[PDB]
Design a protein around this ligand. Structure first.
Ligand code: ATP
Ligand code: ATP
Ligand code: MN
Ligand code: MN
Ligand code: MN
Ligand code: MN
Ligand code: MN
Ligand code: MN
Lengths: 438, 438
């Protein structure tokens, strides 16, 4: 390996020892009798100091020949000194140019010349050389880890369901059709039917973190046609609040992990990520519509709350409850899927919920209707053909425990967590109405 | 929740305490002065003991009405006693029937009546109720966790790349073409191009665990048309041996995690999983051809080792070195992808390798050709058009360090680890030439 330590792994204990650092040339200053080389790696910049009387003459002449973004490797002695901005410098014994960069660069890694989003996406390898972008992807990886750790700690087993499928769906829209040899298939939009089927297996507590594909009609700063969904389904619940309780703790865990493990990144983003306050407020759909009405926003009882409505509610909840996160629940049964269980005592409302983060939905879920005959009737109430869901319905006939779950969008979670304007900032290679490359 | 404890969570410590267990009716013994009920959850069976003198009369009359696979929940008192074959029994206070099972069952959960693989795959929710099948999926989840933990402990950052691609066409057949609105696109067979593009970003050490899609020409016991690939790419390496060293440690870690945390599942499977012995043997392609030739198996230099060659070599490696895992490396350059670096001093050989587990490939990798101009010539040598790779090639022009990586099949790893005859046993809903549904 061309390096022994990253910029962040050199501590005082190594003072006076030989180390190897490597990365991209950030800056070179030839100041006559002394020269400086700064190398940038994933964690920061390291200073290479070359006093004329202390380095090999060949090294002294090589430095000024180095160019921005050249990939280099340096072997030298660690010297902790107040004179070094970051606390220590490396006195070089050897400098190897591994690969030279061409010029001009596609994007300005110094951040001085700003680039439009599309140019940045077309050149992601350059984009991540900027600390504020690398910060987002480091945080994305931490969020995925925190989520899986929480699931594991809570007895959940990871499962994997098919993305190439040929079964019915409730909406029949936004599908990506594909030929599967002589048969017709589609890319999966959610593992919903499959995770429910597995509730009849004894697994009981499952999660899956995998891509979902939806051919969204038009672009928005909140949707992508390819995204990563964090799905869970859990059995033997007594109501949907047990699912909401689990979800909020999972989300709080992810937020706290980022706050604990990625403070450096949040600082680079000049962002103060709030300590979660559980339980999050619960706002019934009825109450949400009343609040929107007073704001001049009309939603007829029975219809889903639109994006403007969510935005207005998010602001209202921040102003009135200092709550960046809150649940909308007890939705009209007519506004949610046929697989959601209705309140037996008040059928017009159902056990579904949406978790809103800064006024944008990050997750949808609820308790499912596990009683076969009622489920079948609900399919009919949606004007659909139960026979088209036979492979799924069969799983409810041989001992199906009550269950519930949610789908939590990873990009949605991260975008809202960091209060970013566009979802394209949180996935490396976005897919939207017109973007298919890189 | 309807349960507080799984069958495996009840210990001496809880003797005399009240708990709630829940699961599927496994057996009922209906006697005049006592009823016994056994229920099954994902970890095992729990005995419920109901003497007439001790339980509520309604509960006593309820038990005989229960039927196999009905879902029930039981609240009662833990009672340890040598008279209970499993060590303890639950003296029930309340029993609730959550859902009733129809008969006949799609599959026999008692294991007495065997069913063919196709029938089991069609009724996966029933199939996992058998301990030996549940065991496989618990181990699958364990392997995924171990792999991710190892990546994290070694400084790798998780990334996520597109499964819908314009082209890359780093090959010809075996691709699933798909329309992306007006454009022609394909399902990704590997994140190869993307993880390489990210080696120019500073991330340096990345991994991705995600679906891959391949329209395999032939139906085999070792291939699927949809699989999960564990991919990694790492920068600043000096040769492919650094990648092989990392990979063997990753696989050893996964194996040891299973041996340590799934001993119970390994026992249910009547399988002894060996302790990994590092380093695994490294066998050059030339040496493999010599071993095979000595055995009467002739492989013309330059051709890949076929399935029988792999089987013979795997057997030889066990006999000669008690090595169920070993590497094949220094393959002919003509036999590997354009992105593999050739030995500059012996160009007909390249820095690619395959990891074999019980005579079956579980992973391929190598050091890549990070030098732009040479890479372009190799694209040409493979009969491909460099212009089809502009977004990828662009990443090699602005400071690209040397790098290498591998693709490790999750199903391949698990199938081989457990010495299972068919890869369909290790993924819930397989996709092959003739199976598209469920
Ligand atoms: N096109 C998309 N891009 C990114 N994430 C998505 C997309 N569609 C859904 N999700 C995520 O998956 C979660 C569950 O999916 P669900 O089908 O309930 O979403 P939805 O109600 O269609 O979302 P929306 O109202 O935002 O379009 C959503 O809360 C969101 O986090
Ligand atoms: N159809 C498949 N089903 C399952 N896993 C696969 C499949 N194709 C490839 N893999 C896994 O991905 C790894 C990397 O893919 P690669 O393209 O090197 O495979 P391959 O050499 O074509 O495999 P094989 O020779 O078995 O067909 C393989 O080592 C294997 O573990
Ligand atoms: Mn939607
Ligand atoms: Mn929604
Ligand atoms: Mn929703
Ligand atoms: Mn193949
Ligand atoms: Mn192969
Ligand atoms: Mn291979």
């Amino acid at each position: 390996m061309y390096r022994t330590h990253y910029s962040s792994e050199i501590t005082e204990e190594l003072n006076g020892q030989k180390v190897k650092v490597a990365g991209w040339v950030w800056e070179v200053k030839d100041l006559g009798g002394i020269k400086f080389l700064w190398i940038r790696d994933r964690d920061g910049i390291v200073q290479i100091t070359a006093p004329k009387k202390k380095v090999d003459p060949e090294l002294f002449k090589l430095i000024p020949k180095l160019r921005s973004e050249d990939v280099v490797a340096v072997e030298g002695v660690v010297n902790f000194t107040p004179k070094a901005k970051l606390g220590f410098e490396i006195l070089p014994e050897k400098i190897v140019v591994l690969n030279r960069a061409e010029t001009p660069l596609p994007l300005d890694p110094t951040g001085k010349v700003k680039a439009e989003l599309d140019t940045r996406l077309n050149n992601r390898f350059m984009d991540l050389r900027r600390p504020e972008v690398m910060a987002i992807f480091k945080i994305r990886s931490s969020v995925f880890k925190a989520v899986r750790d929480f699931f594991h700690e809570n007895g959940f087993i990871e499962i994997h369901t098919p993305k190439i499928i040929a079964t019915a769906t409730e909406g029949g829209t936004e599908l990506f059709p594909m030929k599967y040899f002589e048969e017709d298939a589609f890319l999966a939009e959610s593992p919903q039917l499959y995770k429910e089927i597995m509730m009849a297996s004894g697994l009981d507590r499952v999660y899956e973190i995998a891509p979902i594909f939806r051919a969204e009609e038009h672009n928005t700063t909140r949707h992508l046609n390819e995204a990563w969904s964090i799905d869970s389904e859990m059995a033997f619940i007594e109501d949907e609040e047990e699912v909401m309780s689990f979800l909020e703790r999972l989300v709080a865990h992810a937020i706290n992990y980022v706050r604990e493990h990625n403070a450096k990144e949040l600082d680079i983003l000049n962002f103060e990520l709030e300590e979660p306050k559980l339980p999050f407020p619960r706002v019934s759909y009825d109450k949400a519509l009343e609040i929107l009405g007073d704001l001049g926003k009309e939603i007829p009882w029975g219809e889903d709350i639109d994006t403007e409505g969510e935005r207005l509610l998010g602001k209202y909840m921040m102003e009135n409850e200092n709550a960046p996160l809150y649940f909308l629940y007890q939705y009209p049964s007519e506004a949610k899927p046929f697989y959601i269980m209705k309140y037996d005592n008040k059928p017009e409302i159902c056990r579904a919920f949406d978790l809103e983060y800064r006024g944008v939905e990050i997750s949808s879920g609820g308790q499912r209707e596990h009683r076969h005959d009622i489920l079948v009737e609900q399919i009919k109430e949606k004007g659909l053909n139960p026979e088209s869901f036979e492979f799924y319905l069969k799983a409810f006939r041989y001992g199906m425990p009550p269950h519930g779950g949610f789908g939590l969008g990873a990009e949605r979670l991260i975008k809202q967590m960091l209060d970013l304007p566009n979802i394209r900032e949180v996935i490396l290679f976005p897919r939207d109405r017109r973007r298919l490359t890189p």
